[PDB]
PDB file of C-alpha atoms and ligand atoms in Angstrom:
ATOM      1  CA  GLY C   1      62.429 -56.928 -14.219  1.00  0.00           C
ATOM      2  CA  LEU C   2      61.079 -56.541 -10.695  1.00  0.00           C
ATOM      3  CA  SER C   3      60.438 -59.776  -8.856  1.00  0.00           C
ATOM      4  CA  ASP C   4      56.955 -60.473  -7.574  1.00  0.00           C
ATOM      5  CA  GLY C   5      58.378 -59.410  -4.158  1.00  0.00           C
ATOM      6  CA  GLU C   6      59.851 -56.160  -5.390  1.00  0.00           C
ATOM      7  CA  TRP C   7      56.375 -55.347  -6.828  1.00  0.00           C
ATOM      8  CA  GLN C   8      54.530 -55.974  -3.519  1.00  0.00           C
ATOM      9  CA  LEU C   9      57.201 -53.794  -1.717  1.00  0.00           C
ATOM     10  CA  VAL C  10      56.430 -51.065  -4.346  1.00  0.00           C
ATOM     11  CA  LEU C  11      52.698 -51.438  -3.854  1.00  0.00           C
ATOM     12  CA  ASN C  12      53.107 -51.323  -0.109  1.00  0.00           C
ATOM     13  CA  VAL C  13      54.877 -47.892  -0.047  1.00  0.00           C
ATOM     14  CA  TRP C  14      52.443 -46.590  -2.668  1.00  0.00           C
ATOM     15  CA  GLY C  15      49.559 -47.433  -0.177  1.00  0.00           C
ATOM     16  CA  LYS C  16      51.152 -44.557   1.893  1.00  0.00           C
ATOM     17  CA  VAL C  17      51.160 -42.143  -1.007  1.00  0.00           C
ATOM     18  CA  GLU C  18      47.475 -43.027  -1.664  1.00  0.00           C
ATOM     19  CA  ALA C  19      46.379 -41.868   1.860  1.00  0.00           C
ATOM     20  CA  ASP C  20      47.687 -38.309   0.898  1.00  0.00           C
ATOM     21  CA  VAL C  21      48.110 -37.879  -2.857  1.00  0.00           C
ATOM     22  CA  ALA C  22      47.851 -34.042  -3.123  1.00  0.00           C
ATOM     23  CA  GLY C  23      50.280 -33.539  -0.162  1.00  0.00           C
ATOM     24  CA  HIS C  24      52.914 -35.981  -1.493  1.00  0.00           C
ATOM     25  CA  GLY C  25      52.360 -34.489  -5.051  1.00  0.00           C
ATOM     26  CA  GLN C  26      53.026 -30.933  -3.791  1.00  0.00           C
ATOM     27  CA  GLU C  27      56.225 -31.858  -2.027  1.00  0.00           C
ATOM     28  CA  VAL C  28      57.702 -33.724  -4.921  1.00  0.00           C
ATOM     29  CA  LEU C  29      57.228 -30.670  -7.147  1.00  0.00           C
ATOM     30  CA  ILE C  30      58.792 -28.253  -4.631  1.00  0.00           C
ATOM     31  CA  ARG C  31      61.625 -30.846  -4.232  1.00  0.00           C
ATOM     32  CA  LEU C  32      62.220 -30.885  -7.992  1.00  0.00           C
ATOM     33  CA  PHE C  33      62.068 -27.122  -8.348  1.00  0.00           C
ATOM     34  CA  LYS C  34      64.320 -26.260  -5.517  1.00  0.00           C
ATOM     35  CA  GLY C  35      66.771 -29.053  -6.428  1.00  0.00           C
ATOM     36  CA  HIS C  36      66.957 -28.321 -10.211  1.00  0.00           C
ATOM     37  CA  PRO C  37      65.500 -24.863 -10.785  1.00  0.00           C
ATOM     38  CA  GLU C  38      65.833 -25.194 -14.640  1.00  0.00           C
ATOM     39  CA  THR C  39      62.853 -27.540 -14.455  1.00  0.00           C
ATOM     40  CA  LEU C  40      60.849 -24.625 -13.281  1.00  0.00           C
ATOM     41  CA  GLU C  41      61.256 -22.865 -16.663  1.00  0.00           C
ATOM     42  CA  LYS C  42      59.415 -25.694 -18.228  1.00  0.00           C
ATOM     43  CA  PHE C  43      56.253 -24.537 -16.409  1.00  0.00           C
ATOM     44  CA  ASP C  44      54.670 -21.340 -17.708  1.00  0.00           C
ATOM     45  CA  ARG C  45      52.151 -21.871 -15.056  1.00  0.00           C
ATOM     46  CA  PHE C  46      54.620 -21.864 -12.089  1.00  0.00           C
ATOM     47  CA  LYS C  47      57.467 -19.607 -13.284  1.00  0.00           C
ATOM     48  CA  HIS C  48      55.702 -16.785 -11.320  1.00  0.00           C
ATOM     49  CA  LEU C  49      56.780 -18.759  -8.141  1.00  0.00           C
ATOM     50  CA  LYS C  50      59.823 -17.073  -6.646  1.00  0.00           C
ATOM     51  CA  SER C  51      60.221 -18.994  -3.385  1.00  0.00           C
ATOM     52  CA  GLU C  52      59.332 -22.160  -1.479  1.00  0.00           C
ATOM     53  CA  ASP C  53      56.807 -20.261   0.510  1.00  0.00           C
ATOM     54  CA  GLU C  54      55.205 -18.880  -2.638  1.00  0.00           C
ATOM     55  CA  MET C  55      55.404 -22.588  -3.877  1.00  0.00           C
ATOM     56  CA  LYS C  56      53.790 -23.880  -0.676  1.00  0.00           C
ATOM     57  CA  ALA C  57      50.937 -21.286  -0.925  1.00  0.00           C
ATOM     58  CA  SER C  58      50.124 -22.196  -4.558  1.00  0.00           C
ATOM     59  CA  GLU C  59      46.752 -24.021  -4.787  1.00  0.00           C
ATOM     60  CA  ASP C  60      47.472 -24.939  -8.479  1.00  0.00           C
ATOM     61  CA  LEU C  61      51.038 -26.250  -7.746  1.00  0.00           C
ATOM     62  CA  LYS C  62      49.075 -28.595  -5.347  1.00  0.00           C
ATOM     63  CA  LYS C  63      46.501 -29.655  -7.869  1.00  0.00           C
ATOM     64  CA  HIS C  64      49.188 -30.377 -10.502  1.00  0.00           C
ATOM     65  CA  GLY C  65      51.138 -32.398  -7.855  1.00  0.00           C
ATOM     66  CA  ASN C  66      47.990 -34.533  -7.357  1.00  0.00           C
ATOM     67  CA  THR C  67      47.811 -35.017 -11.187  1.00  0.00           C
ATOM     68  CA  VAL C  68      51.475 -36.188 -11.488  1.00  0.00           C
ATOM     69  CA  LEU C  69      51.098 -38.773  -8.718  1.00  0.00           C
ATOM     70  CA  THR C  70      47.629 -40.024  -9.618  1.00  0.00           C
ATOM     71  CA  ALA C  71      48.947 -40.788 -13.112  1.00  0.00           C
ATOM     72  CA  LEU C  72      52.259 -42.290 -11.794  1.00  0.00           C
ATOM     73  CA  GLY C  73      50.229 -44.591  -9.445  1.00  0.00           C
ATOM     74  CA  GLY C  74      47.955 -45.953 -12.283  1.00  0.00           C
ATOM     75  CA  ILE C  75      51.194 -46.892 -14.034  1.00  0.00           C
ATOM     76  CA  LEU C  76      52.833 -48.438 -10.969  1.00  0.00           C
ATOM     77  CA  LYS C  77      49.727 -50.460 -10.368  1.00  0.00           C
ATOM     78  CA  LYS C  78      50.158 -52.326 -13.750  1.00  0.00           C
ATOM     79  CA  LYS C  79      53.419 -53.674 -12.403  1.00  0.00           C
ATOM     80  CA  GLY C  80      55.300 -53.241 -15.650  1.00  0.00           C
ATOM     81  CA  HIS C  81      52.220 -53.889 -17.977  1.00  0.00           C
ATOM     82  CA  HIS C  82      51.660 -50.116 -18.327  1.00  0.00           C
ATOM     83  CA  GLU C  83      51.905 -49.730 -22.136  1.00  0.00           C
ATOM     84  CA  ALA C  84      48.526 -48.012 -22.535  1.00  0.00           C
ATOM     85  CA  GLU C  85      49.057 -45.733 -19.490  1.00  0.00           C
ATOM     86  CA  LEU C  86      52.562 -44.636 -20.617  1.00  0.00           C
ATOM     87  CA  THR C  87      52.042 -43.723 -24.298  1.00  0.00           C
ATOM     88  CA  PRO C  88      50.043 -40.545 -24.088  1.00  0.00           C
ATOM     89  CA  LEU C  89      52.342 -39.400 -21.312  1.00  0.00           C
ATOM     90  CA  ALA C  90      55.304 -39.987 -23.536  1.00  0.00           C
ATOM     91  CA  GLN C  91      53.497 -38.255 -26.345  1.00  0.00           C
ATOM     92  CA  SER C  92      52.701 -35.019 -24.354  1.00  0.00           C
ATOM     93  CA  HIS C  93      56.039 -34.816 -22.686  1.00  0.00           C
ATOM     94  CA  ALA C  94      58.063 -35.481 -25.797  1.00  0.00           C
ATOM     95  CA  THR C  95      55.865 -33.532 -28.216  1.00  0.00           C
ATOM     96  CA  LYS C  96      54.291 -30.778 -26.254  1.00  0.00           C
ATOM     97  CA  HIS C  97      56.145 -30.006 -23.058  1.00  0.00           C
ATOM     98  CA  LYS C  98      59.515 -30.971 -24.398  1.00  0.00           C
ATOM     99  CA  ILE C  99      60.834 -32.755 -21.324  1.00  0.00           C
ATOM    100  CA  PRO C 100      64.340 -34.261 -21.596  1.00  0.00           C
ATOM    101  CA  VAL C 101      64.673 -37.696 -19.964  1.00  0.00           C
ATOM    102  CA  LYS C 102      67.319 -36.398 -17.546  1.00  0.00           C
ATOM    103  CA  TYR C 103      64.447 -34.324 -16.131  1.00  0.00           C
ATOM    104  CA  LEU C 104      62.656 -37.673 -15.553  1.00  0.00           C
ATOM    105  CA  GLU C 105      65.661 -38.794 -13.561  1.00  0.00           C
ATOM    106  CA  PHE C 106      65.259 -35.573 -11.551  1.00  0.00           C
ATOM    107  CA  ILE C 107      61.716 -36.126 -10.529  1.00  0.00           C
ATOM    108  CA  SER C 108      62.483 -39.868  -9.771  1.00  0.00           C
ATOM    109  CA  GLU C 109      65.099 -38.672  -7.277  1.00  0.00           C
ATOM    110  CA  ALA C 110      62.683 -36.059  -5.685  1.00  0.00           C
ATOM    111  CA  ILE C 111      60.057 -38.863  -5.341  1.00  0.00           C
ATOM    112  CA  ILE C 112      62.493 -41.120  -3.375  1.00  0.00           C
ATOM    113  CA  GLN C 113      63.515 -37.951  -1.410  1.00  0.00           C
ATOM    114  CA  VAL C 114      59.850 -37.404  -0.363  1.00  0.00           C
ATOM    115  CA  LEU C 115      59.256 -41.059   0.656  1.00  0.00           C
ATOM    116  CA  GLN C 116      62.528 -41.264   2.578  1.00  0.00           C
ATOM    117  CA  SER C 117      61.463 -37.921   4.344  1.00  0.00           C
ATOM    118  CA  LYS C 118      57.908 -38.737   5.257  1.00  0.00           C
ATOM    119  CA  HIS C 119      58.195 -42.581   5.786  1.00  0.00           C
ATOM    120  CA  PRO C 120      61.682 -43.633   7.032  1.00  0.00           C
ATOM    121  CA  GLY C 121      59.928 -46.454   8.903  1.00  0.00           C
ATOM    122  CA  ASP C 122      58.066 -47.793   5.909  1.00  0.00           C
ATOM    123  CA  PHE C 123      60.879 -47.241   3.514  1.00  0.00           C
ATOM    124  CA  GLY C 124      63.888 -49.319   4.491  1.00  0.00           C
ATOM    125  CA  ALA C 125      66.871 -50.841   2.442  1.00  0.00           C
ATOM    126  CA  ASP C 126      64.436 -53.098   0.630  1.00  0.00           C
ATOM    127  CA  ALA C 127      61.529 -50.655  -0.184  1.00  0.00           C
ATOM    128  CA  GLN C 128      64.241 -48.172  -1.301  1.00  0.00           C
ATOM    129  CA  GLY C 129      65.658 -50.923  -3.742  1.00  0.00           C
ATOM    130  CA  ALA C 130      62.179 -51.910  -5.065  1.00  0.00           C
ATOM    131  CA  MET C 131      61.064 -48.260  -5.674  1.00  0.00           C
ATOM    132  CA  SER C 132      64.273 -47.182  -7.358  1.00  0.00           C
ATOM    133  CA  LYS C 133      64.022 -50.045  -9.865  1.00  0.00           C
ATOM    134  CA  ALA C 134      60.213 -49.406 -10.332  1.00  0.00           C
ATOM    135  CA  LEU C 135      61.221 -45.802 -11.388  1.00  0.00           C
ATOM    136  CA  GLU C 136      64.121 -46.724 -13.548  1.00  0.00           C
ATOM    137  CA  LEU C 137      61.733 -49.119 -15.356  1.00  0.00           C
ATOM    138  CA  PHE C 138      59.380 -46.176 -15.826  1.00  0.00           C
ATOM    139  CA  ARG C 139      62.288 -43.978 -17.057  1.00  0.00           C
ATOM    140  CA  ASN C 140      63.614 -46.649 -19.484  1.00  0.00           C
ATOM    141  CA  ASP C 141      60.191 -47.134 -21.005  1.00  0.00           C
ATOM    142  CA  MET C 142      59.575 -43.384 -21.384  1.00  0.00           C
ATOM    143  CA  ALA C 143      62.972 -43.020 -22.967  1.00  0.00           C
ATOM    144  CA  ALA C 144      62.251 -45.785 -25.510  1.00  0.00           C
ATOM    145  CA  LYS C 145      58.813 -44.341 -26.425  1.00  0.00           C
ATOM    146  CA  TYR C 146      60.702 -41.086 -26.913  1.00  0.00           C
ATOM    147  CA  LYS C 147      63.223 -42.743 -29.312  1.00  0.00           C
ATOM    148  CA  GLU C 148      60.260 -44.266 -31.350  1.00  0.00           C
ATOM    149  CA  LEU C 149      58.417 -40.875 -31.634  1.00  0.00           C
ATOM    150  CA  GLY C 150      61.679 -39.916 -33.239  1.00  0.00           C
ATOM    151  CA  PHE C 151      62.319 -37.751 -30.108  1.00  0.00           C
ATOM    152  CA  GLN C 152      65.573 -36.817 -28.330  1.00  0.00           C
ATOM    153  CA  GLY C 153      67.632 -40.009 -28.235  1.00  0.00           C
TER     154      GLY C 153
HETATM  155  C1  HEM Z 201      56.743 -39.087 -12.909  1.00  0.00           C
HETATM  156  C2  HEM Z 201      56.837 -38.350 -14.088  1.00  0.00           C
HETATM  157  C3  HEM Z 201      55.683 -37.410 -14.619  1.00  0.00           C
HETATM  158  C4  HEM Z 201      54.397 -37.627 -14.708  1.00  0.00           C
HETATM  159  C5  HEM Z 201      53.526 -38.900 -14.300  1.00  0.00           C
HETATM  160  C6  HEM Z 201      53.736 -36.484 -15.249  1.00  0.00           C
HETATM  161  C7  HEM Z 201      52.357 -36.351 -15.470  1.00  0.00           C
HETATM  162  C8  HEM Z 201      51.853 -35.232 -16.187  1.00  0.00           C
HETATM  163  C9  HEM Z 201      50.416 -35.211 -16.438  1.00  0.00           C
HETATM  164  C10 HEM Z 201      49.459 -36.390 -16.034  1.00  0.00           C
HETATM  165  C11 HEM Z 201      50.128 -34.042 -17.033  1.00  0.00           C
HETATM  166  C12 HEM Z 201      48.723 -33.563 -17.552  1.00  0.00           C
HETATM  167  C13 HEM Z 201      48.346 -34.188 -18.965  1.00  0.00           C
HETATM  168  C14 HEM Z 201      49.444 -33.936 -19.970  1.00  0.00           C
HETATM  169  O1  HEM Z 201      49.634 -32.734 -20.463  1.00  0.00           O
HETATM  170  O2  HEM Z 201      50.306 -34.869 -20.178  1.00  0.00           O
HETATM  171  C15 HEM Z 201      51.385 -33.329 -17.132  1.00  0.00           C
HETATM  172  C16 HEM Z 201      51.579 -32.067 -17.699  1.00  0.00           C
HETATM  173  C17 HEM Z 201      52.790 -31.440 -17.679  1.00  0.00           C
HETATM  174  N1  HEM Z 201      54.010 -31.991 -17.321  1.00  0.00           N
HETATM  175 FE1  HEM Z 201      54.319 -33.782 -16.471  1.00  0.00          FE
HETATM  176  N2  HEM Z 201      54.697 -35.537 -15.477  1.00  0.00           N
HETATM  177  C18 HEM Z 201      55.924 -36.068 -15.134  1.00  0.00           C
HETATM  178  C19 HEM Z 201      57.155 -35.469 -15.257  1.00  0.00           C
HETATM  179  C20 HEM Z 201      57.243 -34.158 -15.792  1.00  0.00           C
HETATM  180  C21 HEM Z 201      58.458 -33.372 -15.701  1.00  0.00           C
HETATM  181  C22 HEM Z 201      59.832 -33.859 -15.164  1.00  0.00           C
HETATM  182  C23 HEM Z 201      58.223 -32.117 -16.156  1.00  0.00           C
HETATM  183  C24 HEM Z 201      59.220 -30.944 -16.305  1.00  0.00           C
HETATM  184  C25 HEM Z 201      60.570 -30.838 -15.967  1.00  0.00           C
HETATM  185  C26 HEM Z 201      56.858 -32.126 -16.568  1.00  0.00           C
HETATM  186  C27 HEM Z 201      56.363 -31.061 -17.270  1.00  0.00           C
HETATM  187  C28 HEM Z 201      55.033 -31.049 -17.535  1.00  0.00           C
HETATM  188  C29 HEM Z 201      54.386 -29.859 -18.077  1.00  0.00           C
HETATM  189  C30 HEM Z 201      55.263 -28.596 -18.388  1.00  0.00           C
HETATM  190  C31 HEM Z 201      53.101 -30.093 -18.139  1.00  0.00           C
HETATM  191  C32 HEM Z 201      51.894 -29.173 -18.516  1.00  0.00           C
HETATM  192  C33 HEM Z 201      51.527 -28.614 -16.994  1.00  0.00           C
HETATM  193  C34 HEM Z 201      50.053 -28.225 -16.985  1.00  0.00           C
HETATM  194  O3  HEM Z 201      49.904 -27.069 -17.562  1.00  0.00           O
HETATM  195  O4  HEM Z 201      49.162 -29.092 -16.503  1.00  0.00           O
HETATM  196  N3  HEM Z 201      56.224 -33.367 -16.341  1.00  0.00           N
HETATM  197  N4  HEM Z 201      52.436 -34.013 -16.576  1.00  0.00           N
END
């Protein structure tokens, strides 16, 4: 799974995200949207955004960013014993928002992109390794809840 070591590496980086959750949150959405624009159409609420600047000015794009990462950090914190935190997520995304898993891959990549950007120092070869596996765990588990809800896969 993740070694005990791999978890503490994960939890160390995340201590960085927790000093600025709304700020990290906002960049990962803009990352996502400007990297894979199609993702944007999934948000009624942000489809009105026509540029990065308009994305950076958006107070609600910021609040939503804080919501994604607060919720991803309560999961990460469980260090793979996240069953109760993941279900509802998998429920809304699968049954209400209709998010394909590949989209989950997309945001995973934007999240590494943001850490790599803001914390090169704090995010070396090992923290990179740790985080990428913490996210693939998260993706795998979403995927499988998907599959059980009889959704797309
Ligand atoms: C790290 C992965 C993600 C996490 C933790 C996350 C978290 C959430 C949370 C906590 C909410 C509010 C409660 C709910 O409706 O579930 C939400 C809503 C939403 N999510 Fe996600 N999300 C993730 C990935 C995605 C992706 C990739 C997309 C689209 C490509 C997306 C689309 C949506 C939409 C369309 C909504 C409703 C937005 C709103 O009106 O608040 N989510 N998400």
